[PDB]
C-alpha cells in the first residue's frame, strides 16, 4: 500500500517535477506529508534514491557532509508519511 | 524485506554503477533477476523511478545505436 519506498514506518513518494525548495515543501504539506529528514534516511539503499532531492532543512540529501550558493536551485523531492 | 520498489509481487533493486546494457543484463542474470519490462512499468507509479534506466529490450526506459550508452538499472525478482 506504499506506492514508493518503505523505510522504518514511513512511505516515501517520489515527485519527479523539479521545484524550488519552498514549492516542494508546500506540495508535501498539500499531501499531509513532509520532506525527508536527513537523520532518518541514513541507509545506503534509500539514499541511492533520495540523493540530490530536497531535505526538510532546505538542503539536498547527500552521501557526503556544500555547494550552498546555487542560483535558482530546483530539485526533485520525496514526500514522507507514516504508514 | 524489499530494499527498493515492491510492485505486485516483484522487488525492484536499484544498481547505481553506470553500466553498458550487456553488463547490466549480465548482472541481473547473475542475481537470478531480470531487467524491467518497459510494458510492465510504463502505466505504473514505477515509471518515474525506472525512466532512463535499462529496460530488458536493450534501451533506456522512456515514456538508435545505444551499445556505448551507460545507465543505472534495476534488477527485478519475484517475491513468493
Amino acid at each position, epitope marked *: 500500500s506504499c506506492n514508493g519506498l518503505y523505510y522504518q514506518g514511513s512511505c516515501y513518494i517520489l515527485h519527479s517535477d523539479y521545484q524550488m525548495f519552498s514549492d516542494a515543501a508546500a506540495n508535501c504539506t498539500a499531501e499531509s506529508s513532509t520532506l525527508p529528514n536527513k537523520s532518518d534516511v541514513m541507509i545506503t539503499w534509500l539514499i541511492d534514491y533520495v540523493e*540530490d532531492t530536497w531535505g526538510s532543512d532546505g538542503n539536498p540529501i547527500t552521501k*557526503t557532509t556544500q555547494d550552498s*550558493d546555487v*542560483s535558482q536551485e530546483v530539485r526533485k523531492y520525496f514526500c514522507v508519511k507514516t504508514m | 524485506s524489499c530494499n527498493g520498489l515492491y510492485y505486485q509481487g516483484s522487488c525492484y533493486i536499484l544498481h547505481s*554503477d553506470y553500466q553498458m546494457f550487456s553488463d547490466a543484463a549480465a548482472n541481473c542474470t547473475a542475481e537470478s533477476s531480470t531487467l524491467p519490462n518497459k510494458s510492465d512499468v510504463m502505466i505504473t507509479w514505477l515509471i518515474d523511478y525506472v525512466e*532512463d534506466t535499462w529496460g530488458s529490450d536493450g534501451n533506456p526506459i522512456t515514456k538508435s545505436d545505444v551499445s556505448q550508452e551507460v545507465r543505472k538499472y534495476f534488477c527485478v525478482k519475484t517475491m513468493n
Partner: antibody, heavy 118, light 109 residues
Framework: QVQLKESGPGLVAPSQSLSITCTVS????????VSWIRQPPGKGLEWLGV???????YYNSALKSRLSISKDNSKSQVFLKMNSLQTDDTAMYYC????????????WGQGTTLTVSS | ELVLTQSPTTMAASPGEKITITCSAS???????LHWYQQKPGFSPKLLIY???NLASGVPARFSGSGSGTSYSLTIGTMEAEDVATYYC?????????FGSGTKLEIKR
C-alpha cells in the same frame, strides 16, 4: 569537505611505465565514480577512464590497450597506470569526482604535471 | 565516439553585452547528460552548468544554458571582465565520455 589529490612521478622516460595515485577524502569511493582526465600543454581535455562505486571500470578506446585504472576503497585511493609512454602523453593529469547522476564532474584535483622525456 | 564541436574557437565579446557559445554533438544526447566547465589558465576546470541549464554553486545568475538533441549552448547575459576563460561542454551519456573542442572567451576594452 570533498578533496582529490593527484601524486605522480613528474618525469618519466619514453617507453617506460607511469603510475599516478588519486587520494580522496570527504567521500567514499564506494559511493561515487572517479574519472581520470588529461590535458596536454595548451590543449583541450581528454577523458581517459572511470571507476564507479561498485568497481565497474570503462576506458577511452583510443588508449585502452595502454591504460589501466584500479582502486583501493579502504585507502581511498584510485590508480592510473600507463605503459609504453610516448611524447604525446605529456600532459596535466586530473582525477575528478562524479556527481551522483548524469556523469558531470563536480570536484577536480589540482592535477599533476607529467612529462615524457629522456 | 560522440564528438562535441564547439563554436567559435575564440570569441571577443563586448563588455556588458549578451554572448552565446555553442556545442554541436555528432550524436543526440538527453539534456540531462550535457554539462559545461569553465577553465582559467593555471587552474583546474570547474563545473559551471549541470544538466544543460542548472547553474552550479557560486555561478552568477548571468550564466544560462539551453539545448536538446545535438545542439546546446551557453549564454552569458552580460559579459564581465572575470568571465574571460576557456569553456568546455561535456557529455556523460556514452563511453567514451567526451569534452568539447573548447571556446576561449575574451573581452573588448
Amino acid at each position: 569537505q570533498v578533496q582529490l589529490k593527484e601524486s605522480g612521478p613528474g618525469l618519466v622516460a619514453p617507453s617506460q611505465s607511469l603510475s599516478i595515485t588519486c587520494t580522496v577524502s570527504g567521500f567514499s569511493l564506494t559511493d561515487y565514480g572517479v574519472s581520470w582526465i588529461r590535458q596536454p600543454p595548451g590543449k583541450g581535455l581528454e577523458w581517459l577512464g572511470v571507476t564507479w562505486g561498485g568497481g565497474t571500470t570503462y576506458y577511452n578506446s583510443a588508449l585502452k590497450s595502454r591504460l589501466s585504472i584500479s582502486k583501493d576503497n579502504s585507502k581511498s585511493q584510485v590508480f592510473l597506470k600507463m605503459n609504453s609512454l610516448q611524447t604525446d602523453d605529456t600532459a596535466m593529469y586530473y582525477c575528478a569526482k562524479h556527481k551522483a547522476s548524469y556523469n558531470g564532474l563536480d570536484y577536480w584535483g589540482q592535477g599533476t604535471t607529467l612529462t615524457v622525456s629522456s | 565516439e560522440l564528438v562535441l564541436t564547439q563554436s567559435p574557437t575564440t570569441m571577443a565579446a563586448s563588455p556588458g553585452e549578451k554572448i552565446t557559445i555553442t556545442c554541436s554533438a555528432s550524436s543526440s544526447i538527453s539534456s540531462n547528460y550535457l554539462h559545461w566547465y569553465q577553465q582559467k589558465p593555471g587552474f583546474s576546470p570547474k563545473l559551471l552548468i549541470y544538466r544543460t541549464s542548472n547553474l552550479a554553486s557560486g555561478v552568477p545568475a548571468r550564466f544560462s544554458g539551453s539545448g536538446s538533441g545535438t545542439s546546446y549552448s551557453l549564454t552569458i547575459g552580460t559579459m564581465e571582465a572575470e568571465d574571460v576563460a576557456t569553456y568546455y561542454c561535456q557529455q556523460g551519456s556514452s563511453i567514451p565520455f567526451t569534452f568539447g573542442s573548447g571556446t576561449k572567451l575574451e573581452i573588448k576594452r
